[PDB]
A paper describes a structure:
FAAP20 is a 20 kDa protein, which binds to FANCA through its N-terminal region and contains a conserved UBZ domain in its C terminal extremity. Several publications indicate that K63 chains are recognized by the UBZ domain of FAAP20 (FAAP20-UBZ), which recruits the FA core complex (FANCA, FANCB, FANCC, FANCE, FANCF, FANCG, FANCL, FANCM, FAAP20, FAAP24 and FAAP100) through its interaction with FANCA. The interaction between UBZ and Ub or Ub chains plays important roles in the Fanconi anemia (FA) pathway, which repairs DNA interstrand crosslinks (ICLs) and other replication blocking DNA damage. FAAP20-UBZ contains an α-helix reminiscent of other Ub-binding domain, the following Ub-binding loop and a stabilizing loop at the N-terminal extremity.
To elucidate the mechanism underlying the specific interaction between FAAP20-UBZ and Ub chains, we determined the crystal structure of FAAP20-UBZ (residues 143–180) in complex with K63-linked Ub2 (K63-Ub2) at 1.9 Å resolution. Unlike other UBZ structures determined so far, FAAP20-UBZ lacks the two short β strands found in the classical ββα-fold. The central α-helix (residues 160–173) is flanked between two loops (residues 143–159 and 174–180, respectively). A zinc ion is coordinated by the conserved residues Cys147, Cys150, His166 and Cys170 and bridges the first loop and the α-helix. Both the α-helix and the second loop interact with the distal Ub of K63-Ub2. In contrast, the proximal Ub does not interact with FAAP20 but contact two distinct neighboring proximal ubiquitins in the crystal through their Ile44 patches. Consequently, FAAP20-UBZ interacts with one Ub moiety of K63-Ub2 in the present structure of the FAAP20-UBZ•K63-Ub2 complex, suggesting that FAAP20-UBZ can bind Ub as well as K63 and other chains. At the UBZ α helix, the side chains of Leu161, Leu167, Ala168, Leu171 and Ala172 and the aliphatic portion of Asp164 hydrophobically interact with the canonical Ile44-centered hydrophobic patch of Ub, which is formed by the side chains of Leu8, Ile44 and Val70 and the aliphatic portions of Thr66 and His68 side chains. The Asp164 Oδ atoms of FAAP20-UBZ further hydrogen bond with the main-chain amide groups of Ala46 and Gly47 of Ub, respectively. Trp180, which is located at the C-terminal extremity of the second loop of FAAP20-UBZ, also participates in the hydrophobic interaction with Ile44 of Ub.
Author numbering:
A (entry chain C): 143 to 180
B (entry chain A): 1 to 76
C (entry chain H): 1 to 75
Write the structure that this text describes.
């Protein structure tokens, strides 16, 4: 589903696979000092 | 069925699971293999942070699916 | 000898080590205490990233030295 990252608002282009998106999300979550929900 | 859990350093953990296994079960398996306490694990798949009480099938996780694992340090 | 490993979450980990211990050995000790796999640990001392095959004495790390531990975001 996700069309943009809920943490950093980067837009997810259609060329990105689900794996790419999950990987991006993981990095954004890890970089945040607090636990985030979305 | 086999799934993969990928860490941020690129390491891949392979797990045998059932579609009805809960996310907590999965974290416990990760602990068994890697020694990481579940409370320090966060899992991501299909645009979602996976919740402990839900099942793999709830998230459409299937054979050879790749989940992403993020670790947290203890706080305090 | 004792060294201190600080995290940005405000935790200080105290470790008992020898000067001849390798960084790999130190990471294993941190895993024992904190449950973080060594491949996910980055250790920094005096602005320098510590390499696994080198020893504490190679970096002039001495009693009551403070290292920093940060989690890796990339391989
Ligand atoms: Zn992001």
């Amino acid at each position: 589903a996700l069309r943009s990252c809920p943490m950093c608002q980067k837009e997810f282009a259609p060329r990105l696979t689900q794996l790419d998106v999950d990987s991006h999300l993981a990095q954004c979550l890890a970089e945040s000092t607090e636990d985030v929900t979305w | 069925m086999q799934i993969f859990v990928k860490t941020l350093t690129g390491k891949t953990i392979t797990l045998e699971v059932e579609p009805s296994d809960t996310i907590e079960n999965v974290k416990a398996k990760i602990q068994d293999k890697e020694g990481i306490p579940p409370d320090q694990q966060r899992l991501i798949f299909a645009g979602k942070q996976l919740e402990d009480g839900r099942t793999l099938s709830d998230y459409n996780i299937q054979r050879e699916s790749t989940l992403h694992l993020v670790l947290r340090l203890r706080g305090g």
